[PDB]
Lon protease
Amino acid sequence: LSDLEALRKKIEEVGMPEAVKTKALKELDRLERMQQGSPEATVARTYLDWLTEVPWSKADPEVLDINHTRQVLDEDHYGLKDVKERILEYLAVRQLTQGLDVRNKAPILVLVGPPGVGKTSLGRSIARSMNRKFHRISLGGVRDEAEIRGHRRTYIGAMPGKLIHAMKQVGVINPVILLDEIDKMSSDWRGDPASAMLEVLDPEQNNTFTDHYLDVPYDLSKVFFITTANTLQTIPRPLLDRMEVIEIPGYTNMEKQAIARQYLWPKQVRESGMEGRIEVTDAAILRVISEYTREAGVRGLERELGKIARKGAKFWLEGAWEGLRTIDASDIPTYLGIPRYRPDKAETEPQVGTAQGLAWTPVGGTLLTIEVAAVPGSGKLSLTGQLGEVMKESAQAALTYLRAHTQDYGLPEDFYNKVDLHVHVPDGATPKDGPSAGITMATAIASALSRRPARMDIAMTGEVSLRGKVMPIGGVKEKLLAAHQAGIHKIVLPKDNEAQLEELPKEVLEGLEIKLVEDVGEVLEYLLLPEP
Amino acid sequence: LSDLEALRKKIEEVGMPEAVKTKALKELDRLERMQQGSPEATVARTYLDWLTEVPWSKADPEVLDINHTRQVLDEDHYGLKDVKERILEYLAVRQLTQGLDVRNKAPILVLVGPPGVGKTSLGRSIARSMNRKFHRISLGGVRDEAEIRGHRRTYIGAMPGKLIHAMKQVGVINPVILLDEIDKMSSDWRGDPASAMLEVLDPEQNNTFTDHYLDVPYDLSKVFFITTANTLQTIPRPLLDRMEVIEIPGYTNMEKQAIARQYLWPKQVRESGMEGRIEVTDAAILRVISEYTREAGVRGLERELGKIARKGAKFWLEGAWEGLRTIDASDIPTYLGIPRYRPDKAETEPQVGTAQGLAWTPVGGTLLTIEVAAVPGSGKLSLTGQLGEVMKESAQAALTYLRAHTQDYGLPEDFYNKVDLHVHVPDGATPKDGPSAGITMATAIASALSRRPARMDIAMTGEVSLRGKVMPIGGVKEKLLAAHQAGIHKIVLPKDNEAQLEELPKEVLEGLEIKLVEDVGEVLEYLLLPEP
Amino acid sequence: LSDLEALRKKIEEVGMPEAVKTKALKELDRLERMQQGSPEATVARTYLDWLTEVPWSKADPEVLDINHTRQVLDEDHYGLKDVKERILEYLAVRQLTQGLDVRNKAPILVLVGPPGVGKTSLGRSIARSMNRKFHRISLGGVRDEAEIRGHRRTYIGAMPGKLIHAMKQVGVINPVILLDEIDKMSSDWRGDPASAMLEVLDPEQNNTFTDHYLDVPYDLSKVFFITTANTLQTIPRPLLDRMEVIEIPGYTNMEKQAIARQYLWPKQVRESGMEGRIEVTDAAILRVISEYTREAGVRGLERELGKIARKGAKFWLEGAWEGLRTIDASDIPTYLGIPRYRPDKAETEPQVGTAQGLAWTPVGGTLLTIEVAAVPGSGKLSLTGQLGEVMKESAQAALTYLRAHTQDYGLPEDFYNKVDLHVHVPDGATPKDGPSAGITMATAIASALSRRPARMDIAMTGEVSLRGKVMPIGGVKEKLLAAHQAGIHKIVLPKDNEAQLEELPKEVLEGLEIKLVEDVGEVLEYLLLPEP
């Protein structure tokens, strides 16, 4: 009928590519009948529509400027001023894609950092700065080669791929596609679509990208892929090549104060119609940072300023008081809730077995408390709390040091066959391949067996090797940031990471009093309430 | 057909968008030729009936005041005194930007709670306060876009979606659609019921939301949508963003007695025509609350009072002799029968191996009676009833504290290799997850091994760590509503939550008698009824 | 000839509505020719043959009274004592709030039961009491709204809906219309027939009930509908509300003998053409009930007694010898051929590995038998035959209870590490596969391990908790009705259910014998013939 007229004109109201035109005229050969009824025309309808709605070889304009790009990139969340150099170096790699116009065997810009620190804002800034468009696909919980690839074109209700879905939305084949959480792909049911994303993510394979709900492979050559991920090593290992590690580290408190006064809170006030009626003094911004969110990103702070703006809308719709209200740090909890975090956690009044430890998580940096119970028995060892064997052998190494140092620290003649040990660590292994918490467990076990109070407010990290030698670790900047944002002021380190301390800004170093030591007896000296 | 002339008029009198004018006049130019129509006359005639009846350009007034909505939301069900403030905050934000400033990217008030606590009534109360026509749409068991969208325009058959019907009924273009039960909606059959919800969610896209029984995208810009879920867990994740969460939990008992004197027992005595002739004392309302239903909310209390009303109609229609009945707590069972439940918990005879945790299932809170058997055997452990390793960590932590302190509870000196344990959790699938039953299982295990009875009548909750400390648990208010409904009168919460404890409205802290602890030795001096 | 004359006279003589008079004019327009055949006008004469017969305001004088309806419902079956009370409450409410149509939207009487019991006899008794005119319509299995609503007079098959046939055969506007098997109505076709009966249910849209054959939609204002199902869990959920569960169970033996003596067999005699020639005492009716059919209702008694009476007529054909041919249970397989069912299910060989639980299918009650094979091996459990997690967990709980008490039951003092158990259930596909066979499996496992006889002729239901207890189970009346169908005389019930044992009729308790327990100790002292 006229629906057949529409789906028949769409064969030549969209000028198709050659093999696509061939299978389209075969779709019309199955057509020229009722548009509904039998199910073989309905699967023909979804097949025709999904193949004649995805756009065919059309693109946006493109810029080769760095100056206007620099202008826009200096206004995302305060401008990071260091990693934008790295992004300008990658866009200088775009300044050499000449012979074969892809430049793979070459980076693709994975963006690594805690969730929401401007990564998506960097994507939006690049999208505005190249006059492109933007779209997101989140790969969270992907294990299926019909989510990414096609599904069997023999059913009504089979699925086109997510990638072809998102390309069906955007009308060109140069969007900026944001692949969010590329690390959380899996392989449980119907193959591993990591190889599918690889075939998306090559020089000369995307331009004939294989589909199976689309029975011709579809051209995806010119899409500016941009990719973000929390971890660094849970990424598919052959796909870990052809990349550029853009580290976006976490912020500090003063930078988030600047972001609040300049970028966040003006949008929060304009998103509740209170232009010119509410203002916040900056000690209250310090209050919101230092008592109401403990993270590395700036998403929760945006929620808090949103709550304050919405309450201001209510209190001004119930009687117009003044031209300018001022909200100091006194009456934040009139507008917000209870103070959910104390600014001084130094009122913990040190524990007995607990070791305060630093940690490298996929969401960046955090603290931990390693929790050790020394119970009577016959001598064993157990570690719980979803740990891996790497933490277990690090504890093995710690005990191997401990067995040769009995009477020097307040321990029995032995504990390898008298005292059972149960160790909880609140998270498991590190995504970096290594237990970065050797001396943490060592101070915990020595504190619990010695029955001597381990001091809190002394965060620490560092390994204990099989020789008991304290080893240099990686990613030190983020654990130092995590110790900074909780207000912790003492760090125990291996000495050999001090070159790592060359890449640390000043205000972080003003509070972190570093004890660059080299052996396990030295943290036992500098930590416990006894001098040993 | 002069009715066909009327069809042409009712097309050509209501002011349409001119694309609808185009397609409707084309349907008139391809009708009036199949007068004996096999469905070509029929489907086109029903199509033009839909293009006449569906509301195009239909005006309806509005509030501009937060204050009249205060005046009206004191007259539905109660005041409820927390959620009234959140509703007015959302409307205060909506008022100061109405007039279409560019900040129309707003969330849409999901109302999470148990079934039947005043959600649809709250929609009706808001819709009275705005003078817009309320209407509901249920989404319980929606799986395919033939239900959200149209499916077949070809022959008369598959209808348009739910939305065009529920706009056709309401004579104006701006209802208050209540989309109930948005979490039970799932992709059951082959089809996507989530992305259509994301399209009706977003205020940029649904300016021209479309279906398939019609061929102009409909103008849904002015519908104040509002949804309703019972569980925040299983909501699709692209929908859980852009979603204002307002949490309505259940009522305490004295609020149930007050709602039943105000709004429920008079409408029930209206509903069975026996006004001014049946009388219910407040002890009777309290008896029917406490001894005949346990659900959170007031569904069951409606059905109970309906039964008393209809029985009164029967007893008066087999003889009229009075001026007025008078029920009290004496003759409830004469109208209802044997009590489904029992009186208060204070007579429930202390078991030797049982603990009464608190929980919040999404159909209302509950007690849990976790029961633990101490089987004389090897020394290993066993867990049944829908448990992962979270409960094994809790059991092992509490058991480690006991292995430290066998002297402190009359235990034998050695039972890691004497006694097996068999733990049975009665509801292992409480979806508000976590080890929030730490001293629950610690009390059960120390009761089962010490042969000394754990008391009933005292609820408790918390977490445990290997040193033997009680950490805080989140969600104090839902735990106290469960402990206040199910009949308990003594609660043991962790010490770390007393700053949370004054957050409550002071209804909830009336009957309850909180014993705040911080270590497991305190709850095992409370709950163990004899000395050891 | 003058068929046009008589029809124009009739259409003016039959009282039309005025809009119906206008559509009668537009049907009249195509007339005035005196030739037959007439493929347009044959449809017209048949349409007016329908339209001169549908009732327009003919009334039957309804009596209100709730005492006449009871003095007529005492001439239905032997006595139901519960559903007659519920029908008196419902019709009492419809006696007060009638005419006072401020209150409306009444529910519509779902009558739930096994097929066979007096559904339509309760319908006809109500219709005798109100002096209305009963007429059924069976709406089980219908998948098409073109059958329930009208049908198009544009291709041949120009018929009204079923409901206009039911209104043609009733010459008034206030009948009692019954809708048998409203849940067997399927929905796999063009037109969901649930929405049609939602419209017929509707007390507002009934006034313009749409037909695709009649032009003006019809009114269903006073038609007192009433519905029937078999289980209320397959009705669609909008239609499930605005129902009233009046739940009819099956009968015991004395009730079926009384129904056959009082009511059935005089009908089946005097419908045969025979009268006063046969004598049947209690023995033959006892035999025909117990050893010839396996149903809940009374279809089988009706059919078999009618076949007996017809073959008694056949024997009377070859001689009118005597007016008294006394029949009893001895000589009855003369008339019915071979008896089908065994005489004794009570004497069922009190052996070891057998357990005899009470259950119920939704065509009538049943007895589950449960086997346990106690083989040597490693110690692990096997469940085949529709055995999920709850039955296995109840088995595991019973096994733990045995491990607590190995001394006084003749067990091996360590058996859990030595004996494998194949627990087989033939019938888990029969409903309620959850825990109601707790002491069933406790007796099965205790006998199959202790190699002591588990008794026939004692039945049991309930649950077991882990410390060793018996919980209560709901729905006591259906279970004891099943136990009095299938021929047992001893029942084990929990202590906790004892209160519900005074909601039953007193007849059920004297044919049976209820052995209440509270623990597993009492049921293990009951059911072992030798105990050690």
User: Anything to note?
Assistant: The domain at 253-336 of chain A is CATH 1.10.8.60 (Helicase, Ruva Protein; domain 3).
